[PDB]
Design a protein around this ligand. Sequence first.
Ligand SMILES: C[n+]1cn([C@@H]2O[C@H](COP(=O)(O)OP(=O)(O)OP(=O)(O)OC[C@H]3O[C@@H](n4cnc5c(N)ncnc54)[C@H](O)[C@@H]3O)[C@@H](O)[C@H]2O)c2nc(N)[nH]c(=O)c21
Lengths: 498, 1196
Amino acid sequence: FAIDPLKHSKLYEEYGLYLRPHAPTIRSIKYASLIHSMLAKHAARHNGTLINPRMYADMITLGNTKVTDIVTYKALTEMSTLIESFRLPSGLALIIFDDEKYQSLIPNYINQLIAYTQPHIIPTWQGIADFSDTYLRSYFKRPFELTASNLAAPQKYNLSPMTRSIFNNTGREDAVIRKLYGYGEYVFIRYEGCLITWTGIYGEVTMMVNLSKRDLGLDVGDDYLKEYKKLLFYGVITDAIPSGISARSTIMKISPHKMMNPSGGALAVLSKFLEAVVSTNVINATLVVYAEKGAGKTSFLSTYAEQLSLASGQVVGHLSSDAYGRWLAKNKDVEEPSFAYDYVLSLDTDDNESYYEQKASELLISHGISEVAQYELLSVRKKIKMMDEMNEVLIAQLENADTHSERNFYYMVSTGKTTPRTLIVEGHFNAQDATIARTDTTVLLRTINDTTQAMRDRQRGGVVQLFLRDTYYRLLPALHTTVYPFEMLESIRRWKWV
Amino acid sequence: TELYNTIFSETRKFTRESFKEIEHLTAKLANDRVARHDFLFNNSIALISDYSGEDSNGNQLQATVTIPNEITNPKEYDPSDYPLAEDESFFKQGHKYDYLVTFRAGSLTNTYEPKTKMYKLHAALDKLMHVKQRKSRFADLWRELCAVIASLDVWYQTTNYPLRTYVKLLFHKGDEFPFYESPSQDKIIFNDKSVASILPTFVYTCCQVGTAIMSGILTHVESIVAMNHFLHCAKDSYIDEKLKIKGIGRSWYQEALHNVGRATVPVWSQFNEVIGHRTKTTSEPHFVSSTFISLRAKRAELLYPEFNEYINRALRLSKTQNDVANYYAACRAMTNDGTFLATLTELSLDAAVFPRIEQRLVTRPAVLMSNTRHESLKQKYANGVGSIAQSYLSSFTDEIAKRVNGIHHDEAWLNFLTTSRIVMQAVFAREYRTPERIFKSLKAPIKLVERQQSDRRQRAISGLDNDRLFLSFMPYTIGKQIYDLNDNAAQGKQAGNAFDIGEMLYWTSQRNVLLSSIDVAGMDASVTTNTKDIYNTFVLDVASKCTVPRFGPYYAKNMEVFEVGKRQSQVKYVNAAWQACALEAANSQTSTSYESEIFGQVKNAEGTYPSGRADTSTHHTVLLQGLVRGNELKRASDGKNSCLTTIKILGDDIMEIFQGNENDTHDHAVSNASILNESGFATTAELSQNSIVLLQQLVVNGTFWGFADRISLWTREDTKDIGRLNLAMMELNALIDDLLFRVRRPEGLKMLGFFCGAICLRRFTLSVDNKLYDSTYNNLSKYMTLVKYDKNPDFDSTLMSLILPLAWLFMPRGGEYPAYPFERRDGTFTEDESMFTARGAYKRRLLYDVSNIREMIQQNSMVLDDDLLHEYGFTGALLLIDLNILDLIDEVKKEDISPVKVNELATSLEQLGKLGEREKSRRAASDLKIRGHALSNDIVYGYGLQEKIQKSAMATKETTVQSKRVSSRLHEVIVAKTRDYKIPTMPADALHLYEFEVEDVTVDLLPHAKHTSYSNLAYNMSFGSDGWFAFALLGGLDRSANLLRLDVASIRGNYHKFSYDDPVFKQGYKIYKSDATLLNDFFVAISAGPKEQGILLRAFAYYSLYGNVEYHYVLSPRQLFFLSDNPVSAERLVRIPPSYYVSTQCRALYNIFSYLHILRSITSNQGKRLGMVLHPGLIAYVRGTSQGAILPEADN
Ligand SMILES: C[n+]1cn([C@@H]2O[C@H](COP(=O)(O)OP(=O)(O)OP(=O)(O)OC[C@H]3O[C@@H](n4cnc5c(N)ncnc54)[C@H](O)[C@@H]3O)[C@@H](O)[C@H]2O)c2nc(N)[nH]c(=O)c21
């Protein structure tokens, strides 16, 4: 293996792979642990680098090479007597998981060997490495799933403490099962997340949640609107968008599952934002958050601002995605408007109608489209023909810098006296990049929502909402860093404050 | 006593008295600043209010000297000229002034306490007005003004000319100068605080205007018009008005050359030859004539009315294309003062690198395959400009993937890390095999690099990084493969000749041709995130067919994949390049952050990425060629004709040539304009029938209208103004040779460069120890004039000033520069050296030419005439060279011959390419250093780029005063030389002993003397001039030689002619004599091609027999732009008498002698044939050596 299973066993406990007790496949993991200790000693002796790594790669992985001045070949003869004392018929293949967290914890003396090695890559379906592999069937314990129908004494099956590990998928307590059904000697795997299979418009949809099954208070058959905020904060749909998740989806199956690891690049960009939040050398720190129209993004970002304000000590501002439109629908005729932040935020209410929504509704009426069924029945050429006419009313605001331009709006809100220092600005599409603020970091957001289903299921706006969604999709590629809400919350939990 | 009454002023010749007189006067002006103040600001000078004279084509003009009140009595500093935002986090959004405003200099005072916002702003503005104006090339700005007005005095023989009245009325404040620059404090120190803040720039402006008078572009009345324009522009902000006026003041030549009617122009072939002339019509089409209304209306509103009257005069009085060219050169000099444009870099940051949205929004392609993070893996356009560009760009993917599969990318990145091993492999395995490297590259910022340039704003360009460049190293490697597959990009090496523009000399000679040229320098701000997605589709299409196992930290592996129509995730085998290009496409940040003194870290709006580097110049090349060739495919797909011939995406230009029917060419031009309007650029192509526009060049009907304002003789950008006389004199020679076909009169350039070198480049300071001071002065004072300074008892050594003899400018190994007629003992004068003369060892012939070769042949002498040379100071000059006191120049600094290239796409792709070859030369140099035979670093191939990479990552002060310490060893060297110094003659000086006698028979001219006689190929070669007659005698150029030198230069990056005094040759000959088994390693280390290895191996065997025998001469390709490089064209011009064929077998050497002499004496050649006269010592030296030893470069 790339990471030593005997020293770093608690890492391998999290993938569900527990060690068989210590058979020619049991002495080999002791042999690999001795090789890891010898490599670590020889690497730390010479400034953290192996001196002749191609020979180490041959001697470990292939096992064909025997070596018989003081710096150079003494360590190689010390390695050769160790490997020759194993009497193996062949070498030991280097084994790497497909997990990015695993690939970022591999030691440097193994990274110096990976260049000269044909490594074995183990795929991970849901983050958990599959148990069907040779090396994981031979070295680690094999799990056994208890369900409601499968639950019996261990003597009904052929199960031993030395071979199998128990996966308690019954919905009952582990000590209850362990005392009442005779599992006192078997080791249970611990999964700290959740895996929900929902019904859908299009089929069966899965969902991974980073909450425990006791914290996430859902059972089989529960409605999607129950605990929707916790699901929205900590959930990821593992199916291809568009998925059939709607407000009337019910639960088919809940299981405990491995908690998702947040992506290192998303955390890199969010930490890059939190550096400008902390440092006194930056006067204004600004985050730009892109998402589709209908991802439920203000309900997350309005609490992201609260958590950032609590963990930072400073005051964090938050403009919604419709702030400029709700400002302009009032102030398009005013010769000298007000750019006060508490005036913009007071216009930012939801019962105010946007300028883009008014112009889009007049456009949809000009084609005689007034019903969601009428818009769904159009052709792709007709839809693109209408979106090319909405682009003509979107360029008029982005095109210059006048007293009502979008650049001027976000300029006079960002550079104001009474405005907060650290602002979180939402956007709709990538062409607003020049227009919105002067921020080094800009992200794209994904939540557990089919936006074309939410803008179809809602009953207030309907056609205008879905049409602006499709236009903003057509103008918003996924060309900035994709961030999930649990990654944005985990960034604040991981950053060290003061 | 004054310069306009000298014997040199009235006769322009160097006699015994006229040399010492001008030497004493220029040594007076070069040293004492009372002399400079009294020279510029004298009381016996009448001022000029009204003046009258001819314009540039001979018509009489009337002008009036007008200096406005707002520069004489300046306003006080208005602090609302530089407003801030309400948060005071940056300047105000729309602020009019990015440059200095014209205000009273003593008004900018900061009363504010330190560590304040306003204190930092006023310190930065004080830095703007005292620090950024200090940009002078050679010396003090007052010395540079004295050299200009000195050469104007000596040329025009009067003091009554209107530029001197501008100098007096602007800078005559009091009894001392109103300001001076200090080299210690690196800033201008104002003496008179009631002066305007813009006059240090007007010193440079008056220098450039006087250069334009001496150059023959402007006359004295046009000088008044130009200075009135510049003084009108200097209210309230000078450079803002210049940038607002600049192009509109120049675009009138279209209508001016329309109103000519017909013109007779030469016709060029495909092979760089004038093949005839042709009476064509220059009357523009209707869609070109429709722009004249808006151009008239914009000029009549915006321009200064006297300059507008001059332009309307040029419209109505110009009769021929030559007249239009003369008026265009005048109006181009009236709108450009040559200075570099510099600000506070956060004033110009907004208008330099802020993004903008133009004309339309670019949409997305349909994602057909995605990552599990829904990052696009492959994708496709539905309709529009994305589909149009991919209809041409998708025909290359399966061919590019073959060339990407063949190369090892981990090796390529190791080559990048090494050239910009086991230690580096350990660094690579530690840093670049981890997913932490991706995270560092997404976390770290991008720093902002800017570059100053003349007549254009400060350009933001992207610099080289280790982390951000690692993300885009693979899309660069993919996108750089189209250069070997198309014709559309011009990335090749630049010859510097008229060979280099010979393609558009061909297309403007042809019939029924429409010409386009798009000014595309502002494209990198208009490029958006959705605009980059056009190129992302092409890169992902190549990467989906490519197969690389590992580009660390990426593997080829079974990856879960969402597709279209599939409700669940599929699994495919996605490889390392298509993980890397997908990750770099999905994670994009284009903002550049600058860290300012006023505001801290100032960041940009996300969107625009600057266009300096190779990875983002490939994007800008591929996208433009894809759009314009896919439009050509779409026209055939719609049924219309396609009349486009060539597209050359240059460094800052797209050049189309359309040939066909007028309706066809107009429709294809309008469609290519509308598609660039569609893709998000607001660019207006300049359509013309007969002229075609670039930077630094203008080709009008097979002619060359060169831009002389873009060569600044007086300012710099690098601020490396040190007292290094050899580097400064080489730079002066390079600039004078660069102006040489852009000037209308090179005889003005010779006098102006002469007085620049005689005043600005004359004094040289060295520090002597105290005990040897007077004994050093008494030794060196026999040959030179020195100035002793005060002896300070508190230190160990004292300075003393060494001003050079004036003859030092004309010397072979010292400063080398074309001379004037020196007077022999017989009263005859040596021939006046042209601008076409060769440097190098050919400058040693002057020592024998003053010593009367015609007497040396008759009397059979070969020694020298030492008394004339000690009279003129040549002995002191050559002793100054032999003491080696002056500063040396590396081969790397010699390779910066400072030659403006035609395209900068080549300079963009120069830095990051050819990594394996530069690594191979590094391995050769290091592993040859281990074996005992070490090479100097200037000869090794990759060091010239490595030094420029690692230099610009330092912020150290490169400005330190240059002092030469004359210790006891250098003292005893002086004592050994000066007690018995006479001129040494090497035995290979016998090649300089030859004579040309004037025969009584005229010579037939070439048949293209008739074709180039109607409308001029350049400004200097008007009919009857020296350049035209040199082209009529020696018709250039040799295409088969220029292709050979470009094929040779495509290995080494630069071409140099072979010499035996080359350090490359000297170290190669040491290795050849000691250990010949290392010649292969040496030839790899210098990166020699298989022809240069043959030349070097012949030269080693010739040198072992004979020594340094070669007849060496140096001609620049810029110096000989239309003329020939092959000396066989001078064979028909000189008659060899038949008694030399009996003795010697060196014909091609005699052709070189004739070639160099005719280029030297083209100023007085009327057309008679010559007669070669050879010295008997020359014949006896020749017949003891093979000719191949003399000319090892040539193949006999
Ligand atoms: C006046 N002047 C001088 N030069 C040239 O200047 C050269 C020497 O310069 P200077 O000797 O003439 O100037 P000056 O004596 O006035 O220097 P000064 O004392 O005023 O400088 C003091 C400044 O240095 C600052 N400073 C310097 N060092 C320190 C330090 N450790 N600590 C604190 N402050 C410091 C001080 O704050 C103060 O501002 C001479 O070789 C001369 O050709 C001129 N050239 C032209 N063409 N026209 C001129 O008018 C002219």
